[PDB]
Design an enzyme around this catalytic site. Structure first.
Site, PDB file in Angstrom:
ATOM      1  N   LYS A   1       0.845  -1.146  -0.335  1.00 38.68           N
ATOM      2  CA  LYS A   1      -0.111   0.161  -0.407  1.00 38.68           C
ATOM      3  C   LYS A   1       1.303   1.592   0.175  1.00 38.68           C
ATOM      4  O   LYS A   1       1.418   1.363   0.516  1.00 38.68           O
ATOM      5  CB  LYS A   1      -1.142   0.194   1.301  1.00 38.68           C
ATOM      6  CG  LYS A   1      -2.031   1.221   1.293  1.00 38.68           C
ATOM      7  CD  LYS A   1      -1.803   1.778   2.550  1.00 38.68           C
ATOM      8  CE  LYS A   1      -2.012   3.397   1.821  1.00 38.68           C
ATOM      9  NZ  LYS A   1      -2.323   4.648   2.844  1.00 38.68           N
TER      10      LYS A   1
ATOM     11  N   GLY B   1       0.972   8.997   1.420  1.00 35.86           N
ATOM     12  CA  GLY B   1       1.838  10.270   2.071  1.00 35.86           C
ATOM     13  C   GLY B   1       1.924  10.669   1.077  1.00 35.86           C
ATOM     14  O   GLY B   1       1.998  11.250   0.068  1.00 35.86           O
TER      15      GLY B   1
ATOM     16  N   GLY C   1      -3.972  11.268  -0.441  1.00 36.16           N
ATOM     17  CA  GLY C   1      -4.163  12.215   0.576  1.00 36.16           C
ATOM     18  C   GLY C   1      -3.938  13.785   0.111  1.00 36.16           C
ATOM     19  O   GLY C   1      -4.709  14.517   0.221  1.00 36.16           O
TER      20      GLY C   1
ATOM     21  N   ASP D   1      -5.743   2.808   3.610  1.00 28.74           N
ATOM     22  CA  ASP D   1      -5.343   1.445   4.623  1.00 28.74           C
ATOM     23  C   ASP D   1      -6.279   0.632   4.845  1.00 28.74           C
ATOM     24  O   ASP D   1      -6.217  -0.841   4.365  1.00 28.74           O
ATOM     25  CB  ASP D   1      -4.853   1.770   6.342  1.00 28.74           C
ATOM     26  CG  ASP D   1      -3.755   3.001   6.494  1.00 28.74           C
ATOM     27  OD1 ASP D   1      -2.367   2.648   5.066  1.00 28.74           O
ATOM     28  OD2 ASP D   1      -3.502   3.687   6.715  1.00 28.74           O
TER      29      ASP D   1
ATOM     30  N   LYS E   1      -4.621   3.433  10.939  1.00 25.68           N
ATOM     31  CA  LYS E   1      -4.114   3.058  10.036  1.00 25.68           C
ATOM     32  C   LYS E   1      -3.491   1.414  10.750  1.00 25.68           C
ATOM     33  O   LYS E   1      -3.589   0.253   9.939  1.00 25.68           O
ATOM     34  CB  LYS E   1      -2.541   3.786   9.907  1.00 25.68           C
ATOM     35  CG  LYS E   1      -1.363   3.187   9.057  1.00 25.68           C
ATOM     36  CD  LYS E   1      -0.617   3.182   8.864  1.00 25.68           C
ATOM     37  CE  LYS E   1      -0.411   4.837   7.786  1.00 25.68           C
ATOM     38  NZ  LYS E   1      -1.021   4.703   6.874  1.00 25.68           N
TER      39      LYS E   1
HETATM   40  N1  LIG Z   1       1.850   7.930  17.332  1.00 26.20           N
HETATM   41  C1  LIG Z   1       1.959   7.860  15.886  1.00 26.20           C
HETATM   42  N2  LIG Z   1       3.081   7.293  15.461  1.00 26.20           N
HETATM   43  C2  LIG Z   1       3.179   7.270  14.093  1.00 26.20           C
HETATM   44  N3  LIG Z   1       2.691   8.034  12.893  1.00 26.20           N
HETATM   45  C3  LIG Z   1       1.477   8.949  14.012  1.00 26.20           C
HETATM   46  C4  LIG Z   1       1.231   9.775  15.267  1.00 26.20           C
HETATM   47  N4  LIG Z   1       0.581   8.999  15.640  1.00 26.20           N
HETATM   48  C5  LIG Z   1      -0.373  10.436  14.922  1.00 26.20           C
HETATM   49  N5  LIG Z   1       1.300  10.194  13.216  1.00 26.20           N
HETATM   50  C6  LIG Z   1       0.799  10.445  12.102  1.00 26.20           C
HETATM   51  O1  LIG Z   1       0.345   8.975  11.233  1.00 26.20           O
HETATM   52  C7  LIG Z   1       0.494   9.742   9.754  1.00 26.20           C
HETATM   53  C8  LIG Z   1       0.435   8.663   9.170  1.00 26.20           C
HETATM   54  O2  LIG Z   1      -0.969   8.659   8.496  1.00 26.20           O
HETATM   55  P1  LIG Z   1      -1.912   9.106   7.066  1.00 26.20           P
HETATM   56  O3  LIG Z   1      -0.727  10.586   7.300  1.00 26.20           O
HETATM   57  O4  LIG Z   1      -3.035   9.122   6.642  1.00 26.20           O
HETATM   58  O5  LIG Z   1      -0.043   8.671   6.503  1.00 26.20           O
HETATM   59  P2  LIG Z   1      -0.333   7.568   5.020  1.00 26.20           P
HETATM   60  O6  LIG Z   1      -1.616   6.847   5.287  1.00 26.20           O
HETATM   61  O7  LIG Z   1       0.756   6.564   4.697  1.00 26.20           O
HETATM   62  N6  LIG Z   1      -0.806   8.335   3.158  1.00 26.20           N
HETATM   63  P3  LIG Z   1      -2.009   8.398   2.588  1.00 26.20           P
HETATM   64  O8  LIG Z   1      -2.327   6.683   1.629  1.00 26.20           O
HETATM   65  O9  LIG Z   1      -2.129   9.005   1.057  1.00 26.20           O
HETATM   66  O10 LIG Z   1      -3.177   9.129   3.338  1.00 26.20           O
HETATM   67  C9  LIG Z   1       2.186  10.469  10.511  1.00 26.20           C
HETATM   68  O11 LIG Z   1       2.645  10.716   9.338  1.00 26.20           O
HETATM   69  C10 LIG Z   1       1.563  11.105  11.267  1.00 26.20           C
HETATM   70  O12 LIG Z   1       1.634  12.344  11.609  1.00 26.20           O
HETATM   71  C1  LIG Z   2     -12.188   8.904   3.574  1.00 22.77           C
HETATM   72  C2  LIG Z   2     -10.735   8.834   3.845  1.00 22.77           C
HETATM   73  O1  LIG Z   2     -10.523   9.726   4.602  1.00 22.77           O
HETATM   74  N1  LIG Z   2     -10.004   9.077   2.737  1.00 22.77           N
HETATM   75  C3  LIG Z   2      -9.078   9.089   2.022  1.00 22.77           C
HETATM   76  C4  LIG Z   2      -8.308   7.890   0.770  1.00 22.77           C
HETATM   77  C5  LIG Z   2      -7.237   8.494   0.064  1.00 22.77           C
HETATM   78  C6  LIG Z   2      -5.863   7.892   1.996  1.00 22.77           C
HETATM   79  O2  LIG Z   2      -5.955   7.244   1.959  1.00 22.77           O
HETATM   80  O3  LIG Z   2      -4.849   8.624   1.725  1.00 22.77           O
HETATM   81  C7  LIG Z   2      -8.414  10.826   1.548  1.00 22.77           C
HETATM   82  O4  LIG Z   2      -7.548  11.305   2.117  1.00 22.77           O
HETATM   83  O5  LIG Z   2      -9.850  10.987   1.276  1.00 22.77           O
HETATM   84 MG   LIG Z   3      -3.401   7.939   5.419  1.00 21.17          MG
END
Ligand SMILES: Nc1ncnc2c1ncn2[C@@H]1O[C@H](COP(=O)(O)OP(=O)(O)NP(=O)(O)O)[C@@H](O)[C@H]1O
Ligand SMILES: CC(=O)N[C@@H](CCC(=O)O)C(=O)O
Ligand SMILES: [Mg+2]
Ligand SMILES: Nc1ncnc2c1ncn2[C@@H]1O[C@H](COP(=O)(O)OP(=O)(O)NP(=O)(O)O)[C@@H](O)[C@H]1O
Ligand SMILES: CC(=O)N[C@@H](CCC(=O)O)C(=O)O
Ligand SMILES: [Mg+2]
Lengths: 258, 258
Positions: B8, B11, B45, B162, B217
């Site tokens: 997956k 980011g 995102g 995720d 996640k």
């Molecule tokens: N305890 C924690 N440990 C690690 N990351 C954390 C924690 N709490 C919050 N985060 C956040 O979790 C983010 C990870 O989730 P997310 O921001 O949605 O990234 P992603 O799922 O990799 N990207 P995408 O698919 O495009 O959304 C990090 O960059 C942090 O800002």
């Molecule tokens: C509902 C939901 O949050 N969807 C995600 C899909 C993209 C991702 O996981 O990075 C979003 O940011 O809009």
């Molecule tokens: Mg995410």
């Protein structure tokens, strides 16, 4: 498997829920009453123009093709390969059709190269491999194919959807129907022209009657007729009562003859 | 066919040409040296936030999920199912990988329903049918699947990527690796946590250490571990030298244990 039929969809159709419902009704009836397998190719210029409008970006078409700078290809891809293709896949799911969304690069279905540096990321579409789509067809899926492609070097390309449909018709050996917002090609008085040859289209272009993307549309239809050895129709998606007969082969718009 | 491996991707990876090149290098080396078939699921995102930024639209996440009004689902679909998915398919073509782009509704691969009226068009993802993707895998294609889905009634849904990856891992019986911009789950001091259980994740959430989408996640990773009976890793896509070992099973981030 029979030769497939490609139905190309574009124009303001996507902005019309009522027109989409009437079209999907007619596609389900055609599919449940015909062995010939259906493929949809789509444009969506209006979806792009609206997202460009909301972004304050100009729309420049050079000889019926949209100039596509490097700073606009990602947004255009999102509107055409994303929003327009997935809106069509959602109407297919609503109607219980198992569809699969593709762009031109999946299975190398249509080969694309940069047409002209003056146009930016606009592709020239040429026939590719039918293996992936033939496999989807034999397994009972409806392919729904957008007009974004990609070059061998990895650059996304915006292809006019009439030319993408013609290239895919040559790749699959498919019949083709080009559906638009107008009832075929219109003469100097705004009246439907029933049949079109290359000589006639040359005359009409010389007389300034066929213009803009219509020039691109007719030339794509003519190429398809000569390449397949079969007529290609240009017709409207607007009038519900005409759809069933149109998909069965009746002349509702302009029949391009090669 | 071996159980597949889903990688997956999300980011800020898509905003980094250098990181994409280093990742695709590592994917080609993994594919040419492993019989296990690869599937990519992706979010994006950041691509959405940038297009929302350019449109002057707010970004509201409610419990790590993006509120998705009816007036924003078409634009979000364009960015995720269109721009992010086709940027990945273009990197795959550049690297001579035959990829096929899909969203969650193709082949009914992942079933989606409306999760909560307070979230709008956000989907709850659940396992669907593996037939289409198994067929693509057996024919040698790399599926690249976005996290947009569609309900049986035809409404497009935004699914957190995720959760979409976890649902697809259950549908295919696949191993899963969640790649992000951080080296796994971090503790109160910003240090990597090497292993994670449900008890530990409960404790960390109670202590306010795991927050926002990280909560989403970890819960998606835990669901996948219990459902498959195999560990699931959360790790970073940032450091080139770690990629090969990571794809081979070495612990580079947080290994979630069920
Ligand atoms: N305890 C924690 N440990 C690690 N990351 C954390 C924690 N709490 C919050 N985060 C956040 O979790 C983010 C990870 O989730 P997310 O921001 O949605 O990234 P992603 O799922 O990799 N990207 P995408 O698919 O495009 O959304 C990090 O960059 C942090 O800002
Ligand atoms: C509902 C939901 O949050 N969807 C995600 C899909 C993209 C991702 O996981 O990075 C979003 O940011 O809009
Ligand atoms: Mg995410
Ligand atoms: N002689 C002509 N006869 C008919 N239509 C003409 C003629 N000259 C120009 N046009 C234009 O051709 C348009 C048809 O091409 P086009 O505008 O690109 O629609 P489309 O291909 O159906 N849609 P899409 O795939 O989304 O771009 C019409 O709506 C007319 O504005
Ligand atoms: C290059 C080119 O003009 N592309 C078309 C593709 C959509 C269509 O045909 O409607 C476009 O408007 O940008
Ligand atoms: Mg057109």
């Amino acid at each position: 498997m029979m030769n497939p039929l490609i139905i190309k969809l574009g124009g303001v159709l996507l902005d019309s829920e009522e027109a989409l419902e009437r079209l999907f009704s007619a596609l389900v009836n055609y599919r449940e009453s015909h062995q010939r397998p259906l493929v949809i190719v789509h444009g969506g210029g209006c979806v792009v123009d609206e997202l460009m409008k909301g972004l304050n970006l100009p729309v420049k078409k050079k000889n019926g093709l949209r100039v596509t700078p490097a700073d606009q290809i990602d947004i255009i891809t999102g509107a055409l390969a994303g929003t327009a293709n997935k809106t069509l896949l959602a109407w297919a799911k609503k109607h219980q059709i198992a569809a699969v969304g593709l762009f031109l690069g999946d299975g190398d279905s249509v080969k694309v190269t940069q047409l002209d540096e003056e146009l930016g990321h606009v592709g020239l579409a040429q026939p590719g491999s039918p293996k992936l789509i033939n496999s989807l067809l034999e397994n009972g899926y409806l392919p729904v194919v957008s007009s974004i492609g990609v070059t061998d070097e990895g650059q996304l390309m915006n292809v006019n959807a009439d030319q993408a449909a013609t290239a895919l018709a040559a790749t699959l050996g498919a019949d083709l129907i080009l559906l638009s917002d107008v009832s075929g090609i219109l003469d100097g008085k705004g009246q439907r022209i029933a049949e079109m040859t290359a000589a006639k289209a040359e005359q009409l272009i010389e007389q300034g009657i066929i213009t803009d993307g219509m020039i691109v549309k007719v030339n794509a239809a003519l190429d398809a007729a000569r390449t397949l050895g079969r007529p290609v129709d240009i017709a409207s998606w607007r009038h519900a009562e005409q759809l069933p007969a149109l998909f069965n082969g009746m002349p509702m718009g302009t029949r391009i003859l090669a």
